[PDB]
Amino acid sequence: SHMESADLRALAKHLYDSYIKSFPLTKAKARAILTGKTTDKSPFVIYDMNSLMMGEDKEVAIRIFQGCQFRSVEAVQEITEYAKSIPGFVNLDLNDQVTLLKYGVHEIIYTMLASLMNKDGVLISEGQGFMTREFLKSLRKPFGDFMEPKFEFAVKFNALELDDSDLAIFIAVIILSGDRPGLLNVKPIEDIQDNLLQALELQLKLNHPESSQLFAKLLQKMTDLRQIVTEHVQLLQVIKKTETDMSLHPLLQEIYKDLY
Ligand SMILES: O=C(O)c1ccc(-c2nn(C(=O)c3c(Cl)cccc3C(F)(F)F)c3ccccc23)cc1
Numbered sequence: 675s676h677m678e679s680a681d682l683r684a685l686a687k688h689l690y691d692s693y694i695k696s697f698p699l700t701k702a703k704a705r706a707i708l709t710g711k712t713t714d715k716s717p718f719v720i721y722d723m724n725s726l727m728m729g730e731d732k733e734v735a736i737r738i739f740q741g742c743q744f745r746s747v748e749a750v751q752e753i754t755e756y757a758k759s760i761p762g763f764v765n766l767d768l769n770d771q772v773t774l775l776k777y778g779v780h781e782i783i784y785t786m787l788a789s790l791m792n793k794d795g796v797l798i799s800e801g802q803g804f805m806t807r808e809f810l811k812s813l814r815k816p817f818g819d820f821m822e823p824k825f826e827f828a829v830k831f832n833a834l835e836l837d838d839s840d841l842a843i844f845i846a847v848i849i850l851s852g853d854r855p856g857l858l859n860v861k862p863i864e865d866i867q868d869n870l871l872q873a874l875e876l877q878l879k880l881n882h883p884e885s886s887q888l889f890a891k892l893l894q895k896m897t898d899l900r901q902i903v904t905e906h907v908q909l910l911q912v913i914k915k916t917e918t919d920m921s922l923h924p925l926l927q928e929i930y931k932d933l934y
Pocket of ligand 1: 738739740742743745746783784787796797798799800810820821822824825
């Protein structure tokens with residue numbers, strides 16, 4: 675209810691530490707890759723079909739779609755370990771830990787995706803590649819239209835100009851949302867988020883002290899995320915059943931066997 679400001683500072687730096695350990699490609703590292711001047715640091719830019727074939731690390735848009743699906747699985751493992759480091763998380767009912775992560779990973783993936791994006795494209799692989807926004811938008815339906823809304827949210831979110839020490843607490847606040855459906859013990863979850871919200875508010879005042887009501891803007895983006903993500907998972911499920919389930923395309927299988 676009323677943590678001391680020193681306690682909130684320690685909580686913030688503990689979260690920053692585990693954030694650095696779980697997520698190797700921080701926003702700071704991604705920004706430096708995006709502005710490097712050498713070819714050694716340079717990510718290979720994929721801007722059309724020929725450039726994509728040269729990058730070594732619908733066959734194409736489905737491979738791209740399944741490529742990001744795999745990266746989200748790796749992100750979940752990293753988010754789960756970071757969530758285990760939030761003080762008091764592992765003391766909750768094991769099913770509430772699952773519920774909180776179940777609804778939370780999709781919102782965190784959207785947020786951390788902004789860390790890899792600018793107005794022109796997105797860092798992919800582990801910073802070794804860069805896919806342009808217009809290439810991904812050009813992908814045949816429904817892939818082109820499924821990926822563009824991520825860019826549209828990122829340029830808004832990145833305008834808030836948050837760093838890793840900010841995102842560490844923001845991600846934790848998302849995870850400890852007491853109003854997820856199906857939660858058993860709500861009060862202990864809210865008691866943790868009350869402390870994280872205090873720690874978040876203090877961090878956004880020490881950082882960005884000229885920035886007016888950044889705490890409020892960030893909270894509004896957070897609830898915006900939930901509606902955005904509900905639509906994202908629903909269309910993602912549609913795409914996974916009508917486009918990547920080869921058992922539903924028996925004639926494409928015959929083509930593949932007859933041509934390859
Ligand atoms: O970690 C990575 O290398 C990485 C990781 C993710 C992307 C990327 N995913 N994505 C999706 O829409 C997406 C897809 Cl297509 C399938 C499953 C899940 C997602 C999700 F991340 F949104 F949740 C994008 C859209 C626009 C731009 C970049 C990306 C890109 C790179």
